[PDB]
Design a protein around this ligand. Sequence first.
Ligand SMILES: OC[C@H]1O[C@H](O[C@H]2[C@H](O)[C@@H](O)[C@@H](O[C@H]3[C@H](O)[C@@H](O)[C@@H](O[C@H]4[C@H](O)[C@@H](O)[C@@H](O[C@H]5[C@H](O)[C@@H](O)[C@@H](O[C@H]6[C@H](O)[C@@H](O)[C@@H](O)O[C@@H]6CO)O[C@@H]5CO)O[C@@H]4CO)O[C@@H]3CO)O[C@@H]2CO)[C@H](O)[C@@H](O)[C@@H]1O
Ligand SMILES: OC[C@H]1O[C@H](O[C@H]2[C@H](O)[C@@H](O)[C@@H](O[C@H]3[C@H](O)[C@@H](O)[C@@H](O[C@H]4[C@H](O)[C@@H](O)[C@@H](O)O[C@@H]4CO)O[C@@H]3CO)O[C@@H]2CO)[C@H](O)[C@@H](O)[C@@H]1O
Ligand SMILES: OC[C@H]1O[C@H](O[C@H]2[C@H](O)[C@@H](O)[C@@H](O[C@H]3[C@H](O)[C@@H](O)[C@@H](O)O[C@@H]3CO)O[C@@H]2CO)[C@H](O)[C@@H](O)[C@@H]1O
Ligand SMILES: OC[C@H]1O[C@H](O[C@H]2[C@H](O)[C@@H](O)[C@@H](O[C@H]3[C@H](O)[C@@H](O)[C@@H](O)O[C@@H]3CO)O[C@@H]2CO)[C@H](O)[C@@H](O)[C@@H]1O
Ligand SMILES: OC[C@H]1O[C@H](O[C@H]2[C@H](O)[C@@H](O)[C@@H](O)O[C@@H]2CO)[C@H](O)[C@@H](O)[C@@H]1O
Ligand SMILES: OC[C@H]1O[C@H](O[C@H]2[C@H](O)[C@@H](O)[C@@H](O)O[C@@H]2CO)[C@H](O)[C@@H](O)[C@@H]1O
Ligand SMILES: OC[C@H]1O[C@H](O)[C@H](O)[C@@H](O)[C@@H]1O
Ligand SMILES: [Ca+2]
Ligand SMILES: [Ca+2]
Ligand SMILES: [Ca+2]
Ligand code: NA
Length: 481
Amino acid sequence: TNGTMMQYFEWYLPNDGNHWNRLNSDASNLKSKGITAVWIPPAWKGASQNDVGYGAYDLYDLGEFNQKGTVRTKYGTRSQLQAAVTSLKNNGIQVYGDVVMNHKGGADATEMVRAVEVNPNNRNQEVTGEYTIEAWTRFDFPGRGNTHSSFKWRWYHFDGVDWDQSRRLNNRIYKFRGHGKAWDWEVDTENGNYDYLMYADIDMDHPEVVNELRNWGVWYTNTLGLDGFRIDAVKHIKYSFTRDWINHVRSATGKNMFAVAEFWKNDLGAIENYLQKTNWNHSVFDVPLHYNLYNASKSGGNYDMRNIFNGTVVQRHPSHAVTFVDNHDSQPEEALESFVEEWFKPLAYALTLTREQGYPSVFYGDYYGIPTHGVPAMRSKIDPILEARQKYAYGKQNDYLDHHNIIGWTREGNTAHPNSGLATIMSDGAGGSKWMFVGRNKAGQVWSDITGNRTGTVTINADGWGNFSVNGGSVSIWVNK
Ligand SMILES: OC[C@H]1O[C@H](O[C@H]2[C@H](O)[C@@H](O)[C@@H](O[C@H]3[C@H](O)[C@@H](O)[C@@H](O[C@H]4[C@H](O)[C@@H](O)[C@@H](O[C@H]5[C@H](O)[C@@H](O)[C@@H](O[C@H]6[C@H](O)[C@@H](O)[C@@H](O)O[C@@H]6CO)O[C@@H]5CO)O[C@@H]4CO)O[C@@H]3CO)O[C@@H]2CO)[C@H](O)[C@@H](O)[C@@H]1O
Ligand SMILES: OC[C@H]1O[C@H](O[C@H]2[C@H](O)[C@@H](O)[C@@H](O[C@H]3[C@H](O)[C@@H](O)[C@@H](O[C@H]4[C@H](O)[C@@H](O)[C@@H](O)O[C@@H]4CO)O[C@@H]3CO)O[C@@H]2CO)[C@H](O)[C@@H](O)[C@@H]1O
Ligand SMILES: OC[C@H]1O[C@H](O[C@H]2[C@H](O)[C@@H](O)[C@@H](O[C@H]3[C@H](O)[C@@H](O)[C@@H](O)O[C@@H]3CO)O[C@@H]2CO)[C@H](O)[C@@H](O)[C@@H]1O
Ligand SMILES: OC[C@H]1O[C@H](O[C@H]2[C@H](O)[C@@H](O)[C@@H](O[C@H]3[C@H](O)[C@@H](O)[C@@H](O)O[C@@H]3CO)O[C@@H]2CO)[C@H](O)[C@@H](O)[C@@H]1O
Ligand SMILES: OC[C@H]1O[C@H](O[C@H]2[C@H](O)[C@@H](O)[C@@H](O)O[C@@H]2CO)[C@H](O)[C@@H](O)[C@@H]1O
Ligand SMILES: OC[C@H]1O[C@H](O[C@H]2[C@H](O)[C@@H](O)[C@@H](O)O[C@@H]2CO)[C@H](O)[C@@H](O)[C@@H]1O
Ligand SMILES: OC[C@H]1O[C@H](O)[C@H](O)[C@@H](O)[C@@H]1O
Ligand SMILES: [Ca+2]
Ligand SMILES: [Ca+2]
Ligand SMILES: [Ca+2]
Ligand code: NA
């Protein structure tokens, strides 16, 4: 019953064009482990074959056309992708496709465009007069032609770029000039106006652009049979556009598509504003929680575990939070590196997987490892927690975040799941024990640690209380197994 999604990729995967095939054959295994939804990496053609996908070149080329020196994407061909999707569907797993609509990179050619430079620290401040630059804004898709779509992109479909091919200057941001040209609003306010991020910034003020992206959203959904989306860089995209794009896609397909947006800012207030402005029609990744987990793992036991959920989306708006431990941007060497230390990772996953609030996600990099950076596969430690979520994490939740090192919570279970109920206890410091209430109807039951970290048993007393124990810097999940 409890749903769990998985980000099925990491940044440093090999460019072997065999990832779709890997996902294909891993489908039954994932379902058996408790995974109910899979977020697949960008499926379209990037600026090159080894692009992770965020250097989005052609959203209609899913590894089908000869463009950018390759037919397949880094992950494989369109047919292999479709085969992977079918495999997931046949195993009862929902599919969420990534969505990049903030920018387009790898333009086919440059164009001469009128523009003014703006302050990188305050994009609302123009720092030069108007002049002509050579920008990478032309997209004709020579390898695809008009197959699937005849829409061609030009400078007027964009708000700006960060590179003038004729002068090649560093640390510059160019805002295009022209009828109705201006940074979009509303967007995040860091740097004054955070509409611009990288590559050629799409202008959400252009009617043709809005219409085209909405149409692509539907094509994309119907072509792959997607059940939902993971929306990239939303703090840089006009808020109302994203809100209405999701509504349009849901209406056009007659499907209540699930959607999780990546609003990357360690600021609950900013995220709440985004949620209100998009009318709460979709979820968001709990970025603040990720940072709390990261900081806790770096504090050597001095993090006040009683505050692990403070300032988080899952605490404030549980229904709209997708909880994650790490992702492709927080992993080693990447842009937002803030990787939760290995010793704390099991505690982190227990915090997201065994509590009643939020929609938890498992990171491919954590589960299977990141060979290129010495990160071992942790599925052996994650699997027991996934089993706890699938069979035991049900019913009323009782919180015990009452100690700076040792915290815990219990689930009283429900009749829908046999023997359900659990008692999670963890410590970022010295080990110990804690008395916790699991329910009077559990009196006499002999519980054991599903993680295997503790080998003893805990007998629930006649009053429904158990004295649960945990080792130092570890997590134990006691259940009636
Ligand atoms: O032989 C090699 C190469 O040749 C050809 O490539 C040419 C290409 O076809 C042609 O379009 C042009 O490329 C232009 C490009 O079109 C322009 O848009 C421009 O691109 C630069 C972009 O504007 C910059 O913002 C910068 O992008 C950075 C971001 O700023 C970073 O933040 C980072 O973003 C990533 C982030 O870290 C991740 O967390 C995730 O969000 O993903 C993000 C995206 O990856 O990285 C990006 C990428 O570095 O730099 C862009 C340039 O790399 O300028 C380009 C020209 O400099 O010219 C190409 C060279 O002739 C051929 O087509 C290729 O197939 C072939 O590989
Ligand atoms: O957000 C990160 C950074 O993103 C941007 O930097 C990009 C550029 O936009 C790309 O154009 C590219 O830069 C190349 C450049 O195309 C290439 O000519 C060469 O640059 C030379 C330059 O021509 C020459 O005049 C002199 O200045 O030496 C340069 C270095 O040899 O090499 C560049 C680097 O590969 O890639 C960069 C990096 O992704 C944006 O402009 C930055 O402000 C921003 O920090
Ligand atoms: O029982 C052995 C040992 O248990 C306790 O040590 C735990 C630490 O209190 C706890 O913080 C954690 O230690 C990690 C550090 O926080 C981290 O910075 C880095 O050094 O990794 C450590 C784990 O590898 O976990 C340990 C238990 O492994 C107790 O404090 C000790 O006195 C006791 O000897
Ligand atoms: O994975 C299959 C399942 O995914 C989706 O369900 C998720 C919800 O979309 C999401 O809001 C979240 O809901 C839970 C709340 O976050 C939590 O606080 C508490 O209220 O429980 C809610 C679930 O009962 O997580 C679920 C996944 O469990 C999608 O909507 C379903 O249609 C799909 O079957
Ligand atoms: O430079 C001529 C013309 O370019 C742009 O107009 C675009 C328009 O935005 C598109 O929607 C479509 O109609 O193609 C036009 C170019 O042929 C500028 O927006 C416009 O001001 C300018 O006159
Ligand atoms: O329609 C606006 C609505 O916003 C808030 O309700 C949110 C709530 O805050 C979230 O936690 C979650 O439950 O989604 C709700 C919207 O469906 C306000 O609380 C509410 O008064 C207001 O009508
Ligand atoms: O530079 C990497 C990151 O730095 C800061 O966290 C910015 O808020 C974010 O937008 C950016 O992606
Ligand atoms: Ca605009
Ligand atoms: Ca933007
Ligand atoms: Ca502590
Ligand atoms: Na824009």
